[PDB]
Design an enzyme around this catalytic site. Sequence first.
Site, mmCIF file in Angstrom:
data_model
loop_
_atom_site.group_PDB
_atom_site.id
_atom_site.type_symbol
_atom_site.label_atom_id
_atom_site.label_comp_id
_atom_site.label_asym_id
_atom_site.label_seq_id
_atom_site.Cartn_x
_atom_site.Cartn_y
_atom_site.Cartn_z
ATOM 1 N N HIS A 282 3.086 11.059 6.520
ATOM 2 C CA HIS A 282 2.366 10.749 7.768
ATOM 3 C C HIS A 282 3.328 10.154 8.777
ATOM 4 C CE1 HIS A 282 -1.650 10.488 5.465
ATOM 5 N NE2 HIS A 282 -1.277 11.778 5.726
ATOM 6 N N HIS B 64 0.849 -1.227 0.000
ATOM 7 C CA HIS B 64 0.000 0.000 0.000
ATOM 8 C C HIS B 64 0.873 1.262 0.000
ATOM 9 C CE1 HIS B 64 -3.307 -2.684 0.547
ATOM 10 N NE2 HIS B 64 -2.814 -3.136 1.688
HETATM 11 N N1 LIG Z 1 -2.599 6.777 6.551
HETATM 12 S S1 LIG Z 1 -2.696 6.848 8.144
HETATM 13 O O1 LIG Z 1 -1.586 7.613 8.682
HETATM 14 O O2 LIG Z 1 -4.003 7.286 8.533
HETATM 15 C C1 LIG Z 1 -2.532 5.201 8.774
HETATM 16 C C2 LIG Z 1 -3.249 4.141 8.236
HETATM 17 C C3 LIG Z 1 -3.097 2.862 8.783
HETATM 18 C C4 LIG Z 1 -2.214 2.627 9.832
HETATM 19 C C5 LIG Z 1 -1.962 1.211 10.337
HETATM 20 C C6 LIG Z 1 -3.184 0.553 10.823
HETATM 21 N N2 LIG Z 1 -2.947 -0.731 11.484
HETATM 22 C C7 LIG Z 1 -3.805 -1.110 12.475
HETATM 23 O O3 LIG Z 1 -4.999 -0.735 12.551
HETATM 24 N N3 LIG Z 1 -3.147 -1.871 13.411
HETATM 25 C C8 LIG Z 1 -3.336 -3.209 13.791
HETATM 26 C C9 LIG Z 1 -2.472 -3.657 14.784
HETATM 27 C C10 LIG Z 1 -2.642 -4.907 15.343
HETATM 28 C C11 LIG Z 1 -3.685 -5.708 14.918
HETATM 29 I I1 LIG Z 1 -4.045 -7.526 15.902
HETATM 30 C C12 LIG Z 1 -4.528 -5.294 13.897
HETATM 31 C C13 LIG Z 1 -4.345 -4.047 13.330
HETATM 32 C C14 LIG Z 1 -1.525 3.698 10.361
HETATM 33 C C15 LIG Z 1 -1.662 4.976 9.845
HETATM 34 ZN ZN LIG Z 2 -1.043 7.651 5.728
#
Ligand SMILES: NS(=O)(=O)c1ccc(CCNC(=O)Nc2ccc(I)cc2)cc1
Ligand SMILES: [Zn+2]
EC number: 4.2.1.1
Length: 258
Positions: free
Chosen positions: A117, A62
């Site tokens: 970011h 991504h």
């Molecule tokens: N573009 S941005 O800055 O808005 C951005 C987009 C995506 C992310 C990462 C999201 N990852 C996440 O939800 N972590 C996660 C951790 C452990 C488990 I178990 C499942 C999921 C960071 C920053």
């Molecule tokens: Zn981002």
Amino acid sequence: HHWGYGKHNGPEHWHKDFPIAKGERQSPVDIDTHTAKYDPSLKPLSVSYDQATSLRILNNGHAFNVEFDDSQDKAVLKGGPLDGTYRLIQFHFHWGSLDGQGSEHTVDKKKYAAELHLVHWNTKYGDFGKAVQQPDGLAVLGIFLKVGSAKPGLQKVVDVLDSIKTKGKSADFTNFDPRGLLPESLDYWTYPGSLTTPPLLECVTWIVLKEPISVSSEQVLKFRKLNFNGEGEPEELMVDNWRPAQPLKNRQIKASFK
Ligand SMILES: NS(=O)(=O)c1ccc(CCNC(=O)Nc2ccc(I)cc2)cc1
Ligand SMILES: [Zn+2]
């Protein structure tokens, strides 16, 4: 048939697997500079990156993430709109196929060539995975990129991208100093929002700097040589990995400056 940025799996499709895509505090948004109001109660941002410990760079299919050691309080973001201490875990970018697009936030509908970011998580929740489940779990520092003069502090990132061309590739990436990616001014806008990729969790305090950084045409051309695909799969250039602006709904964007 996983999410991505194609015609068939792009942002207008994400709501089918991630219904929060149509939620009340989604990101990014357009920043209407005339409607944003100065909030004299905000504080100067505190960006403390002198002890930052970078570890690795990863192509995740991504974007690419520069990851940090977040097992102690080294590189932290505090102040501004934030309560408490947020630890730097990774940074990444979103960029275009052309210099006229690529940012996720827009400023009076202007698109920049790219957007950095810097992702931080609230230490009161113990780990990043717990923090994304909270409405104040993350703080993302967003910085616009425009094409002009090279950014010398970006070149170490540009030069490793050949080693992580395809999805799932990583490389050691120690001693990278993220202070070299910051503009001179820390004037910002702030609003409550979301991750801009699935799972689109509503856990982010957004802090978007007003002053873009300049990168050269050659630097962004090297971002556009990356691949979305894995090795030994059809080449699909990693370009236009941005979500467009989402409805502001019942939110106010606050300015740190007059
Ligand atoms: N573009 S941005 O800055 O808005 C951005 C987009 C995506 C992310 C990462 C999201 N990852 C996440 O939800 N972590 C996660 C951790 C452990 C488990 I178990 C499942 C999921 C960071 C920053
Ligand atoms: Zn981002």
